């Protein structure tokens, strides 16, 4: 009956909790107590990109570490050349309510989506000389939160109907759907070798999914409300999350536990975005208090602040070679720090 | 720019033309009036959009129309079953809110209390501290027919007025206005929807004008 199944789930939860606790002899801090501190991180602003006329909601770096794309609520996608602050393309959208954007790893296509429950794929290289819509992918029943290219023919999306999906851009049909969350999925992150990915949702839990067969492998809890951002460590064996309780967290795949908590007593606002450095030593996080903090990821110390925006910082990214950091904000500006 | 090459100058000229087109498009799109349409399930939103769709030009639904050389756009988000707290901050900065309530629900499952809860949630929000609300009370005739048999006291235990339209409608209107807690900043406009054509859109037009004028006067006096 139902009651025996609830008791069975309680016994399985107790078994998981005891098996996790039985292999936690030492802390990450005790191990990294003898490391020298990083010191002080002082980053200046090198470029300022202007031309948006409303709030900026997403951005993504190109894989050549020079070009990038930005999305805003005035109904434009803009492609920027960060070295000279020139505009390469400007794409008008059919819907002004856009919440995410992505850049293909090859450079040929660009993806977009928002409150219209549709993911749009745009072709950047054509004989006619203008950017045109290549495909529209429909089938989600809630707003689209994030999207990431795996290839020129495969894309992974997450939505506020508590599901994720994997698409086939040639055909336009879902090949696999990932279910199990009980809240709106808000963020998503691909592994470096592109065989697994993580998803963070509004039930205050994160899940590890396997791309080849749509099954969940591990579930990580510990937050208190509404994980908003997630990212992989460069090694591919750990990840970090950021939520509304003004706290970042570091989770480890192989030990299936929690390693460190990045919280301060003077910070009481939520976190919008999170990212790592190139070597995985610094953790950068954006907040609602118009700032951006830089944390020593191994000693859990505050190392720096980026304080050049006038409204909420909504998006944040680091280049592939690790030469610069880009931040976007609701005051309609993008800045490059180095 | 004296060290640039021949191709760099043409790239800069292309970027300047892109800037010009962006500025002209923003100047053109800054002359719109944006309204957010809300309600509690089946209230009569379809009737309002049908009887205001004077001209013609799931996800989200759009409607563009003109009335006395003034353009309006009305967004409807009744198909979003996800969490409202995660996408409502996209709609701050709209000109006004159109809230639709049906008067025939005072004895149905009441269902009026759900409308009261939604109005209290949206009127005292942290993003709509200054956005004006236009309130439509649809289904007047069916309320007239139903009140003659089912007394209003089934909805309000504290009611003590007469069982007739003129008193009960004013009592409902006051039990909906008396939920604002910022009577110094915003305002509530009430209109009992009538089947006669043009009247409803006229009321919207008058309200949006007298809201724009008070905004221009409130702000430009800052110094």
């Amino acid at each position: 009956e139902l009651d025996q199944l609830r008791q069975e789930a309680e016994q399985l939860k107790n078994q998981i909790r005891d098996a996790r606790k039985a292999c936690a002899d030492a802390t990450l801090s005790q191990i990294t107590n003898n490391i020298d501190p990083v010191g002080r991180i002082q980053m200046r602003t090198r470029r300022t990109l202007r031309g948006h006329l409303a709030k900026i909601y997403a951005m993504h770096w190109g894989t050549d570490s020079r070009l990038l794309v930005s999305a805003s609520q005035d109904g434009k996608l803009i492609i920027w050349d960060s070295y000279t602050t020139n505009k390469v393309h400007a794409i008008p959208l059919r819907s002004s309510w856009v919440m995410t954007c992505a850049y293909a790893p090859s450079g040929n296509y660009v993806a977009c989506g928002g409150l219209d429950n549709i993911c749009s794929i745009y072709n950047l290289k054509t004989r006619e000389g203008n950017v045109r819509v290549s495909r529209e992918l429909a089938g989600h029943t809630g707003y689209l939160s994030c999207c990431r290219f795996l290839d020129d023919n495969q894309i992974v999306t997450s939505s506020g109907d508590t599901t994720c999906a994997l698409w086939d851009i040639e055909t336009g049909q879902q090949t696999t759907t990932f279910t199990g969350h009980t809240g709106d999925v808000m963020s998503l992150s691909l592994a470096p070798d592109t065989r697994l990915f993580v998803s963070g949702a509004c039930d205050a839990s994160a899940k590890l999914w396997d791309v080849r067969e749509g099954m969940c492998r591990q579930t990580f809890t510990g937050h208190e409300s509404d994980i908003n951002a997630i990212c992989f460590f460069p090694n591919g064996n750990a990840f970090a999350t950021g939520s509304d309780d003004a706290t970042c967290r570091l989770f480890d795949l192989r030990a299936d536990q929690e390693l460190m908590t990045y919280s301060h007593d003077n910070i009481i606002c939520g976190i919008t975005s999170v990212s790592f450095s190139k070597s995985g030593r610094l953790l950068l996080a954006g907040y609602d208090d118009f700032n951006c903090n830089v944390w020593d990821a191994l000693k859990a110390d505050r190392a720096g602040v980026l304080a050049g925006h006038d409204n909420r910082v909504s998006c944040l990214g680091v280049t592939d070679d690790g030469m610069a950091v880009a931040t976007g904000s609701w005051d309609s500006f993008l800045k490059i720090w180095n | 720019g004296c060290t640039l090459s021949a191709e760099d100058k043409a790239a800069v000229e292309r970027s300047k033309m892109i800037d010009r087109n962006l500025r002209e498009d923003g100047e053109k799109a800054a002359r719109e009036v944006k309204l957010l349409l809300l309600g509690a399930g089946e209230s009569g939103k379809s009737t309002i959009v049908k009887q205001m769709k004077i001209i013609h030009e799931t996800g989200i639904v759009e409607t563009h129309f003109t009335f006395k050389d003034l353009h309006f756009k009305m967004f409807d988000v009744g198909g979003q079953r996800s969490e409202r707290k995660k996408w409502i901050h996209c709609f701050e900065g709209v000109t006004a809110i159109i809230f639709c309530v049906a008067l025939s629900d005072y004895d149905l499952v009441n269902r009026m209390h759900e409308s009261m809860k939604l109005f209290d949630s949206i009127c005292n929000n942290k993003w709509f501290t200054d956005t004006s609300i236009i309130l439509f009370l649809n289904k007047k005739d069916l309320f007239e027919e139903k009140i003659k048999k089912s007394p209003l006291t089934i909805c309000y235990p504290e009611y003590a007025g007469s069982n007739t339209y003129e008193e009960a409608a004013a009592y409902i209107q006051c039990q909906f206005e008396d939920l604002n807690k910022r009577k110094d900043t915003k305002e509530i406009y009430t209109h009992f929807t009538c089947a006669t054509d043009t009247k409803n859109v006229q009321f919207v037009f008058d309200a949006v004008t007298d809201v724009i004028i008070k905004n221009n006067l409130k702000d430009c006096g800052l110094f």
């Epitope: 390469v88 | 191709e7 043409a10």
Partner: single-chain antibody, 233 residues
């Protein structure tokens, strides 16, 4: 498909005037810059005139200043050249070329068809060895083109372009900026070289690769071509 068709050529009494037109169809005309390039009856190519996108920049060759005028009409998708005081040295064949400039683009990618005009009775120098070398199908060949002034800019780019003209046709882009392979070109063509010394390498030479090869520089106006080297069986 992409098309550029020219008209307005014929026999002209010297000292007269004429107008040439170039009608495009198949692409976004208003986003491209346009060039007029002419070819003498038995010699190589020479750049003539250039009009920008948005008509904000116009350049002319050193020999047609004060005589020729270039213009465009965007709604009808037309490019015009007005020619006055026609000297007998203007007898040539005129081509209409499109080019677009942004980070990563490929200028000079589509060439027109050509119209024939028969008038009755500080520059960078690019050098090539014009002797028609013999080839056989299967082997590999190299082509050289040395400049007088270094084509390497300070931003890392080297502005050299390679074109191929098969017998009785219009030129075709092969290599742009000394290394990049054009779209639709088989991977048998390679381009390399340092400043003031460049090489084009063809491996596994087929039977459709006979013709004339030209090298061009795009470092600064006026644009200058080479004399052109011929491959024949």
């Amino acid at each position: 498909d992409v098309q550029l068709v020219e008209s307005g050529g014929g026999l002209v009494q010297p000292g007269g005037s004429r107008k040439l037109s170039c009608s495009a169809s198949g692409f976004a005309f208003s986003s491209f810059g346009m060039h007029w390039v002419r070819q003498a009856p038995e010699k190589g190519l020479e750049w003539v005139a250039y009009i920008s996108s948005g008509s904000g920049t116009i350049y002319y060759a050193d020999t047609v200043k004060g005589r020729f005028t270039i213009s465009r009409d965007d709604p009808k998708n037309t490019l015009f050249l007005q020619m006055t005081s026609l000297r007998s040295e203007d007898t040539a064949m005129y081509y209409c070329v499109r080019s677009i400039y942004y980070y990563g683009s490929s200028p000079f990618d589509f060439w027109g068809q050509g119209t024939t005009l028969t008038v009755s009775s500080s520059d960078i120098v690019m050098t090539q060895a014009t002797s028609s070398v013999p080839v056989t199908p299967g082997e590999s060949v190299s082509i050289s083109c040395r400049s007088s002034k270094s084509l390497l800019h300070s931003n890392g780019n080297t502005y050299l372009y390679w074109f191929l003209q098969r017998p009785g046709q219009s030129p075709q882009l092969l290599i742009y900026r000394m290394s990049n392979l054009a779209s639709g070109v088989p991977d048998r063509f390679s381009g390399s070289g340092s400043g003031t010394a460049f090489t084009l390498t063809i491996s596994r030479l087929e039977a459709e690769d006979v013709g004339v090869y030209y090298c061009m520089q795009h470092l600064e106006y006026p644009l200058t071509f080479g004399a052109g080297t011929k491959l024949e069986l």
